[PDB]
Amino acid sequence: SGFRKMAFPSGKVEGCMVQVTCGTTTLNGLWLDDVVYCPRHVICTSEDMLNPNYEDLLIRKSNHNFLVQAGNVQLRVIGHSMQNCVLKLKVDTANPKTPKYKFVRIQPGQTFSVLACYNGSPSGVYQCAMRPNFTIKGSFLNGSCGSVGFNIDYDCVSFCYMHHVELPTGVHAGTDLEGNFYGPFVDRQTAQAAGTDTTITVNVLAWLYAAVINGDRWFLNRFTTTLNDFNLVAMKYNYEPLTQDHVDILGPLSAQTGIAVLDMCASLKELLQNGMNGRTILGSALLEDEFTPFDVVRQCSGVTFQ
């Protein structure tokens, strides 16, 4: 029993974390096969980040201006390219620690494990979620740029995030492994507005299912509600609208607990209108939205990986 915010084992990802230095800027890179992926702002100075012409700044650079270090081993760069906002450095050595991997662009609300790195050295690992406004609430200091988020199916590491920018509001933004930013953000030191952030409603419901499984059942009423009546409560409290697709993915949790999805929505509706009255759910006084329905099923059944 017990429920914890759990991150995937980071071993398969640590073996791909290298250090990329271009001039004075040093950040982290993802070494897969014979290609190193890193944020393209490694080619920028501090003044450049105000308004950088990345095409021009990349032209001034050659292959030998990029220093890639895998621990203590230097990697000779034999080619460089810019795909959107990431830099693709072709090296002469294929990474022997390369795991099975894909490049996946996740959707808002999905979760992934983040391996925070500095100077190509792994520092820590934590689980976070892609907010509906395409930001993430992570822990990123200077030098963490190039840290990657990922999911592990079993033997396959689905890389889905690379950190690029910390917004002036303290939240973070980045791209997928093809350089395409999540959301309207850009890799430039300017005032960037993140939209209104809502709560991932389907994640809150799955977390409530995890609580019933683990003994916390005080929030269970026998009130029920319709999908439209609940979404009327969801819009008032800045919750994402619940669709039939969300009900379908909560199916197995509803079958294991024997609690209908709409019955749990009425419990959440009462939680939103009345609060928690000082009580706790799974050791939390707030409504958690960083557990997808898939995350709850994994932890409540013991799904392992390589």
* Residues involved in catalysis: 41, 145
Joined tokens for residue 89? 């450095």
Report strand pairing: 111-118 vs 121-129: antiparallel
Chain positions 87 to 126 lying near a second copy, rule: CB under 8 A, are: 115-119, 121-126
> CA-CA distance, 170 to 206, in Å (whole number)?
28
- As beta bridge partners, residue 75 has 68
> CA-CA distance, 147 to 116, in Å (whole number)?
5
Q: Residues 235, 228: contact at Cβ < 8 Å?
A: no
Q: Which range in 34-42, 51-59, 221-229, 280-288 contacts a second copy by CB under 8 A? A: 280-288
Q: Write down the least CB distance from residue 116 to a second copy, Å.
A: 7
> CA-CA distance, 123 to 120, in Å (whole number)?
9
Q: Write down the least CB distance from residue 17 to a second copy, Å.
A: 9
Contact with a second copy (CB under 8 A): which of 170, 191, 244, 245?
170
Please name which of 190, 188, 136 lies closest in space to residue 162, comparing C-alpha atoms.
136
**Interface characters, 171-190, with a second copy (x: CB under 8 A):** xx------------------
Calculate the CA 224 to chain-centre distance: 33
Q: Write down the least CB distance from residue 231 to a second copy, Å.
A: 24
Q: Write down the least CB distance from residue 56 to a second copy, Å.
A: 31
- C-alpha pair distances (Å), 220 with each of 52, 96, 112, 144, 229: 54, 52, 29, 42, 18
Calculate the CA 79 to chain-centre distance: 29
Q: Is residue 197 within the footprint of a second copy (CB under 8 A)?
A: no
> CA-CA distance, 78 to 213, in Å (whole number)?
54
Give every strand in the sheet of 25-32, ordered side by side.
Answer: 73-75, 66-70, 17-22, 25-32, 35-39, 86-91, 77-83
Is the Cβ of residue 126 or residue 237 nearer to a second copy in the bound state? 126
Q: Which range in 35-43, 141-149, 173-181, 258-266 contacts a second copy by CB under 8 A? A: 141-149
Chain positions 199 to 258 lying near a second copy, rule: CB under 8 A, are: 214-215
Q: Is residue 146 within the footprint of a second copy (CB under 8 A)?
A: no
Q: Which range in 183-191, 192-200, 223-231, 294-302 contacts a second copy by CB under 8 A? A: 294-302
Is the Cβ of residue 128 or residue 234 nearer to a second copy in the bound state? 128
Is the Cβ of residue 90 or residue 298 nearer to a second copy in the bound state? 298
Q: Which range in 59-67, 197-205, 258-266, 295-303 contacts a second copy by CB under 8 A? A: 295-303
Site for a second copy, rule CB under 8 A:
1-12, 14-15, 115-119, 121-126, 128, 137-144, 166, 170-172, 214-215, 280, 283-286, 298-306
